[PDB]
Amino acid sequence: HMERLLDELTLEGVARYMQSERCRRVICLVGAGISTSAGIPDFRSPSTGLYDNLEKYHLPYPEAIFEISYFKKHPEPFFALAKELYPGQFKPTICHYFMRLLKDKGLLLRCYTQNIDTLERIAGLEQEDLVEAHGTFYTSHCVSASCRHEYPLSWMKEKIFSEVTPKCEDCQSLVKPDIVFFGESLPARFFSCMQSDFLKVDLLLVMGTSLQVQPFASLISKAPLSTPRLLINKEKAGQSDPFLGMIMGLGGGMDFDSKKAYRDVAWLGECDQGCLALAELLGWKKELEDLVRREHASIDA
Amino acid sequence: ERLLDELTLEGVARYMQSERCRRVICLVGAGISTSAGIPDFRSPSTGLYDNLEKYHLPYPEAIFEISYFKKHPEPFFALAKELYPGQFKPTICHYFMRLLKDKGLLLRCYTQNIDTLERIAGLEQEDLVEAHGTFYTSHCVSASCRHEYPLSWMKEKIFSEVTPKCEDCQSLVKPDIVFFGESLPARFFSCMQSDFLKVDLLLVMGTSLQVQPFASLISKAPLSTPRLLINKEKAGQSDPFLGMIMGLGGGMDFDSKKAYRDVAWLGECDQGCLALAELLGWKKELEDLVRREHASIDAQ
Ligand SMILES: Nc1ncnc2c1ncn2[C@@H]1O[C@H](COP(=O)(O)OP(=O)(O)OC[C@H]2O[C@H](O)[C@H](O)[C@@H]2O)[C@@H](O)[C@H]1O
Ligand SMILES: Nc1ncnc2c1ncn2[C@@H]1O[C@H](COP(=O)(O)OP(=O)(O)OC[C@H]2O[C@H](O)[C@H](O)[C@@H]2O)[C@@H](O)[C@H]1O
Ligand SMILES: NC(=O)[C@H]1CCCCc2c1[nH]c1ccc(Cl)cc21
Ligand SMILES: NC(=O)[C@H]1CCCCc2c1[nH]c1ccc(Cl)cc21
Ligand SMILES: NC(=O)[C@H]1CCCCc2c1[nH]c1ccc(Cl)cc21
Ligand SMILES: NC(=O)[C@H]1CCCCc2c1[nH]c1ccc(Cl)cc21
Ligand SMILES: [Zn+2]
Ligand SMILES: [Zn+2]
Numbered sequence A: 001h002m003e004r005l006l007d008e009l010t011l012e013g014v015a016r017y018m019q020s021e022r023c024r025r026v027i028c029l030v031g032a033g034i035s036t037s038a039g040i041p042d043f044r045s046p047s048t049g050l051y052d053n054l055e056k057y058h059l060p061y062p063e064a065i066f067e068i069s070y071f072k073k074h075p076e077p078f079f080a081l082a083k084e085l086y087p088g089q090f091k092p093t094i095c096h097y098f099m100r101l102l103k104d105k106g107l108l109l110r111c112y113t114q115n116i117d118t119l120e121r122i123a124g125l126e127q128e129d130l131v132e133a134h135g136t137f138y139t140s141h142c143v144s145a146s147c148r149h150e151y152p153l154s155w156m157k158e159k160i161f162s163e164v165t166p167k168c169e170d171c172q173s174l175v176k177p178d179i180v181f182f183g184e185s186l187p188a189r190f191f192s193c194m195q196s197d198f199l200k201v202d203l204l205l206v207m208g209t210s211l212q213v214q215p216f217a218s219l220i221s222k223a224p225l226s227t228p229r230l231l232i233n234k235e236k237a238g239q240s241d242p243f244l245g246m247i248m249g250l251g252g253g254m255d256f257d258s259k260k261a262y263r264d265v266a267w268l269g270e271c272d273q274g275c276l277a278l279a280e281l282l283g284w285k286k287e288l289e290d291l292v293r294r295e296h297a298s299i300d301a
Numbered sequence B: 001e002r003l004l005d006e007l008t009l010e011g012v013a014r015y016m017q018s019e020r021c022r023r024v025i026c027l028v029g030a031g032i033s034t035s036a037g038i039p040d041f042r043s044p045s046t047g048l049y050d051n052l053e054k055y056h057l058p059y060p061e062a063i064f065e066i067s068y069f070k071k072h073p074e075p076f077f078a079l080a081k082e083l084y085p086g087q088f089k090p091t092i093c094h095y096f097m098r099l100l101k102d103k104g105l106l107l108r109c110y111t112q113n114i115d116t117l118e119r120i121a122g123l124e125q126e127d128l129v130e131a132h133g134t135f136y137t138s139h140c141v142s143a144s145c146r147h148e149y150p151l152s153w154m155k156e157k158i159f160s161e162v163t164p165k166c167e168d169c170q171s172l173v174k175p176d177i178v179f180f181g182e183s184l185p186a187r188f189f190s191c192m193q194s195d196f197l198k199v200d201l202l203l204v205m206g207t208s209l210q211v212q213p214f215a216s217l218i219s220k221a222p223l224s225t226p227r228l229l230i231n232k233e234k235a236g237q238s239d240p241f242l243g244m245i246m247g248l249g250g251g252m253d254f255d256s257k258k259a260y261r262d263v264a265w266l267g268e269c270d271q272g273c274l275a276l277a278e279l280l281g282w283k284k285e286l287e288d289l290v291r292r293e294h295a296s297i298d299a300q
Helices: A011-019 A062-066 A068-073 A076-085 A094-104 A153-161 A188-197 A216-222 A271-282 A285-300 B009-017 B030-036 B060-064 B066-071 B074-083 B092-102 B151-159 B186-195 B214-220 B269-279 B283-298
Strands: A026-030 A108-113 A130-132 A135-142 A150-152 A175-179 A203-207 A229-233 A264-268 B024-028 B106-111 B128-130 B133-140 B148-150 B173-177 B201-205 B227-231 B262-266
Touching (some): A011 A203, A011 A264, A062 A068, A062 A076, A094 A108, A094 A271, A130 A188, A135 A153, A203 A216, A229 A271, A264 A271, A271 A285, B009 B201, B009 B269, B024 B092, B024 B214, B030 B092, B092 B106, B092 B269, B092 B283, B106 B186, B133 B151, B148 B151, B151 B173, B201 B269, B227 B269
Parallel strands (some): A026 A108, A203 A229, B024 B106, B024 B201, B201 B227, B227 B262
Antiparallel strands (some): A135 A150, A135 A175, B133 B148
């Protein structure tokens, strides 16, 4: 028995599902695409993404800048980049406030984000609503596993803006913000929330991510088989033919287009515009626009 | 659900002797051929990816990556000329799988190797999924053309220092070994759909399980199917870390408090298989097979 929960594979089909009694608990899965309209670059957009804009650091490959083994050999490019990107003041987007609407309508079980920009918090989601799957810059740690001395943000900021490579005062090993680099463990909260959240999710809303890194990309496969999954993104993601070096596990992807497609919908365009379009369908558009307006003005005050 | 009486080689052996254990699938990588003189990829210092400095690659894997290959095919065809001429013998591990087949237990061997030592050991093409392809045939890389060429054609080009070119469309021609970014053989998929439905035991040997989709295979068995790893190091087990190869929960659980079906025997693949053969009472038989087959090869 496969439960067929969407009456059609469109944004309109999803919206009707959301209004029904059957849709109680939504998980948002989000990445750097939801913050681009605020001024923050993403990673893997050709030419505009951060990984196509690190020429000056002379890295062996772009991912090295956020990679734990490279970092330990050559910490300077990371701290140089942090000094550049940290100052930027950004505001949440329409997409972030849409998630606030879910929260305030009793629909948000959790937002899992791969971003460190904190814009989900700034938009009004609370700690408990959030899994910051790829860490936070708020706290820092010595990288030495036998030490792990914790340091606060003021300590880290002071080091970066004094152009001093932060070192632990106990063991002299490098210190870094708790943002998750390639090769580094995810916060424990990720796994503990995931195990219970994904048993009871009625809709996955996947926004502004290419699903190109594990274990985050595995989350789509943790949902029950009947749970509809809506992608709002510039491009399809999670749907590709298998090949050697593919990121997802075999049969772990999205199925928007095949003869067997039953539950996955791709809305192709900007996240803000897709969130506006979906809010319109749900009768929430004015409320959303009102909230954005009010919260931006308040942020300026 | 627990089928092993204990999570040890002994427990696995007793399970293999039970009526329940009809169908065994072997999942193998380059570790089963190191004792035969062939380097693996990822072992420190000795592995192939730690010994490509001369080709000045941006990263080691680029030598077996399709887009890099089209732009710079010279390194791979240089590397192939060095390695193709080596002559090697199947290992005790390879003959242990031959024994599985002859005992009527082998449903399939899925290999990530292109050395053919499985075939040389006596496994037949029907027993095999050569998951990462074969050198025996070669194809033009152009999707509109796909002209096939045999081994003789490819060797003539390699050993004359001529970058192989399709005689029709002039595109590059490579052996049907699977590069990063390339499709796996059709057979991998059709066999996978059918083989893992009723599989009673997975035997994973000599692989770091560091590449997809091959690494997914362990998670295709039913949840109750025991899985035994014979390998120098543990593979398939970690906490969630960014960039990990395994899907979340698609790995092995040897050491957790909830561990119920995975067993890791750490050591040499050869000695591992001997130890298991011993526990099944096959040790003399295996040793006889190895000796005769190695003598047969020596006799050229
Ligand atoms: N305004 C927009 N509207 C909709 N989609 C967009 C927009 N802007 C960009 N996109 C799409 O948004 C997607 C952005 O994908 P990626 O750039 O890979 O970011 P990630 O968050 O998935 O990266 C994950 C991790 O990898 C890193 O190493 C870090 O660890 C990250 O946390 C693309 O599909 C764009 O087409
Ligand atoms: N004699 C031995 N006994 C036991 N274990 C061994 C032995 N020798 C090596 N090992 C272990 O055996 C493992 C060797 O793992 P890797 O070197 O990654 O080879 P793969 O076949 O998995 O590489 C997969 C693909 O990656 C490439 O891109 C190609 O596409 C390959 O087909 C390690 O865990 C060793 O500790
Ligand atoms: N908008 C975000 O926050 C994205 C994109 C901007 C750069 C920082 C960044 C993001 N996600 C990350 C995950 C891990 C690390 Cl080390 C850094 C980042
Ligand atoms: N500018 C900021 O508001 C935040 C969030 C936006 C992305 C850049 C970014 C921030 N903090 C960082 C710390 C380190 C790095 Cl590499 C990048 C960043
Ligand atoms: N020499 C041979 O017995 C075989 C199997 C052993 C590994 C090397 C190897 C062989 N054939 C090859 C063709 C191309 C490349 Cl790149 C490498 C090889
Ligand atoms: N013993 C094998 O055959 C291993 C290790 C020796 C090098 C060739 C090689 C192996 N596996 C492969 C998979 C794909 C490619 Cl392109 C090449 C190889
Ligand atoms: Zn320390
Ligand atoms: Zn051709």
